[PDB]
Amino acid sequence: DVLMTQTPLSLPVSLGDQASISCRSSQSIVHSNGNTYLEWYLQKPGQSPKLLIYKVSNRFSGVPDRFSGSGSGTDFTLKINRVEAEDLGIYYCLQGSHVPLTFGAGTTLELKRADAAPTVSIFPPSSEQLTSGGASVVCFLNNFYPKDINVKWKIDGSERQNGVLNSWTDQDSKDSTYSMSSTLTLTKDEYERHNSYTCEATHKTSTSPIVKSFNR
């Protein structure tokens, strides 16, 4: 199959910036009829992909002129001249020349802002959940930037990997930050058989993790 390689994986931009996204195919995508079926799509959360450019360089109807596509052979580029807020989202390239048709992995265009360490908060199981026989420990890692972050749970100093579920928000409309929730779920029996619970946040803003804990 034709592999479509998109770079960069993510591109931070300020409004009004120039933006340029690359898509490279692993082999030629010239169809036997002579055409090159290379398309660019923009997709926002909860919506279908919207077609921006078709056949390499042709702007689809209703698409603002600030979008333009170019390329030849295995080498393709999408440019945005003066990025606006509605341009933020994930961009995909698609080759339609050789079956199976294949997409690039996507490039996220996101709003640039100052780096910001997460605000980390940890919460023991509620009495109500314990009564019901369950035990969930919740850690919020809020309003950080950039989006990459890692969380580690420690029970009595020991790293726990099972029973952890994570969720991430989309970039905040007001402060351009990201947030993450991490939940460690145990039986009540096992929760009461330990003392210290710890969530550790590793983020680019520091060399040392932000560590938050409570002791039963």
Next chain:
Amino acid sequence: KVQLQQSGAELVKPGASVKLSCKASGYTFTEYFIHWVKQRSGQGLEWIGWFYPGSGSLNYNGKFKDKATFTADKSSSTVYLELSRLTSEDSAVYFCASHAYDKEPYWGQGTLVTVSAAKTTPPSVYPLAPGSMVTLGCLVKGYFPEPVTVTWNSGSLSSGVHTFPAVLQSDLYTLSSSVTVPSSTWPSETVTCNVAHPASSTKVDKKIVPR
């Protein structure tokens, strides 16, 4: 105007099959190709195959040959994607797209497919209170299906709120919501999370009180 109407969201029992529909209008049905595209939550797009109702010709991405079957009803301008023996990996949005040969495609809005054996179940709502600003939260656990609506103080508290996407585990959804307020506002004033679940026709409130 070329339009594609996809069927509504599907809740599918594990192991069962589901048949999704894409009904077209605004062009000669037998002269356009229909493609199906899969997108798992938070992931990219994956091409399933193409189908040409006008001849019954088709091609499947090898990755989907044992999973997908394309059919059509020319009498209703509808193409179908049947997915067999569903697993958690089949939970995704499925888009249909239509185009004439050498012309640009039009995409449907997509159909959400969720695999679970759960019946309709209201959420258990648990307060998250701490052990200048203070962060509080609510854990919304064990419900089915999506969605729920979470507000704080009946909507009056909207700044500083983060409601996280739900995660399906053991056939049921769980989500959390956090809110951050000045320390001089809580616990001195009331902070309450409100959780509505349309499918079970329920709405519950949980006041956050100090531990």
